[PDB]
Amino acid sequence: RVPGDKNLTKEGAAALCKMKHLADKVAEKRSQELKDRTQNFAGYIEFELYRIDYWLEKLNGYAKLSDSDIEKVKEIFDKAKDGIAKQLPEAKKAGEDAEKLHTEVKEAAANARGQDLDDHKSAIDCSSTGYEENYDWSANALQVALNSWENVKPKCTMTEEWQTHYKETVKKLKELEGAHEKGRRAHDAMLGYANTAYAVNTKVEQEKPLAEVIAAAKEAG
Amino acid sequence: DAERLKHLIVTPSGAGEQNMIGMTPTVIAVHYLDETEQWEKFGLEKRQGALELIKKGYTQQLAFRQPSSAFAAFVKRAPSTWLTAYVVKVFSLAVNLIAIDSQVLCGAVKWLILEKQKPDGVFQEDAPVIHQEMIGGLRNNNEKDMALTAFVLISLQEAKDICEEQVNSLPGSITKAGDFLEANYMNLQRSYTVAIAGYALAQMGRLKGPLLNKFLTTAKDKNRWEDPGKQLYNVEATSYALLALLQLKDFDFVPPVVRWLNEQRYYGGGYGSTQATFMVFQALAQYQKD
């Protein structure tokens, strides 16, 4: 508590309620969602490698294929594993970063919410922030809530030590969201190859001729 | 309540599809009578006879299990993704009633994951069922990828504890199918798909936020998930939606929903009642349990 120039306004009390709420949703919910979803990407890429292997075991539907025909299917299967595996070193790095980044994001937001609560306490109600729930808990939402407080920020007032932890929450949440995207762009790049291999397995089990299985593999890429 | 359910005790008969149509009523009627405890009002001596008919339906169904662990109406017919998922759904609920082979059930679950789940999490039907009346609201086919993926994923979630140790790809399959449903939920137009995908997502704690708002808002008069068309589909959808409300532990919205389902006075029946009979009694027996 330090002396200031202006009285706190309704738009200043609401900005404080939103920053505490955003930090609470990041520390208790968002952080875990970004970690789980980033780490699942590497598991889907590995599943498509394991799954193509199981289809490769069936070349030993599949029994109707001639000796020359099985080599074509095997080649298509081996080239899909090449394209899927190519995306695994980026999706594994994303999931390894999202393990360390989650604990920094969860910690910084928890500290920013214990001092921000004491900044309200007579205490500010914060019931209108829960009603105006838009479910946007990104680093950009945390930033615009900080930007809105910085405009209505009275220079009687209180100190801003909570702001140092909140600034770290925004910085680390951007890093955590960047790891999610690095693994999202790897998962999506793996899809073309895994779709080609899925389309071949269906055409081979439906006993379609060789021209049909090759045409279906080409259309799924 | 039990005096009107005597017609549900059916002797199963027929090929791979007809066996599950005939099996369905007996299975869910035993399950409803155990939960609601109406065996004294129905006939106590009749429980053992009903279990033998369910075992009879189970054993006759194994004549249609293919070398691939998948099911079809006849052995020389291409396997059905819907039929296999439905068999998994009835056997998952009959584990407490009769002895179910775990390899039979978990082979079907593994076939669904390895053969029929697309890389994007969507379950694919490459050989539809001949009896289109046994699939219910799925028949319209409007949003096929969304509704069929909710159906198969509900069957996998019900078989999860049984097959977690035998099907290593089951956990990741469930989340991948739930990813697709969650991503395309807000764009659903049919009240039937809102209720079947709502329940599929509720089973894994992802029916929340805007998804939970759209689910509760598609309910006409806060009691039913009505689609302009078939009254059988509306009972089926409101049953899937009641199972999501109980899963959400939302015992505030539940009373007028159960009231509407009871007001329908639906007791199952023959032609076209496969999904409405299975789902109206699964949801009412679960409401009594919770």
Residue numbers in the entry:
A (entry chain A): 27 to 86, 94 to 154, 196 to 229, 251 to 316
B (entry chain B): 996 to 1285
How did the manuscript describe this experimental structure?
Here we demonstrate that an invariant surface glycoprotein, ISG65, is a receptor for complement component 3 (C3). Within the VSG coat are found invariant proteins, including nutrient receptors, and a family of invariant surface glycoproteins (ISGs). C3b deposition occurs by a chemical reaction involving a reactive thioester within its thioester domain (TED). In this study, we show that ISG65, which is distributed over the entire trypanosome surface, is a complement C3b receptor.
We expressed C3d in E. coli and combined it with the ectodomain of ISG65 1125G expressed in CHO cells. Crystals formed and the structure was solved to 2.6 Å using molecular replacement. Two copies of the complex were present in the asymmetric unit, with each receptor contacting three different C3d molecules within the crystal lattice, with surface areas of 814, 553, and 530 Å2 for interfaces 1, 2, and 3 respectively. C3d mutations at interfaces 2 and 3 had little effect on affinity for ISG65 when compared with wild-type C3d, whilst both mutations at interface 1 had a large effect on binding to ISG65, with P1114R ablating binding. This allowed us to define interface 1 as the physiological interaction interface for ISG65 binding. While ISG65 residues 24–385 were included in the construct used for crystallisation, just ~60% of the chain was resolved in the electron density (residues 27–86, 94–154, 196–229, and 251–315). The ordered core of the ISG65 N-terminal domain consists primarily of a three-helical bundle, with helices 1, 2, and 4 lying approximately parallel to each other, creating an elongated architecture. At the other end, short helix 5 forms a hairpin with helix 4, placing the C-terminus along the helical bundle, opposite where C3d binds. The curvature of ISG65 produces a concave surface into which C3d binds. The location of the ISG65 binding site does not overlap with the thioester of C3d, which allows ISG65 to bind to C3d that is covalently coupled on the trypanosome surface.
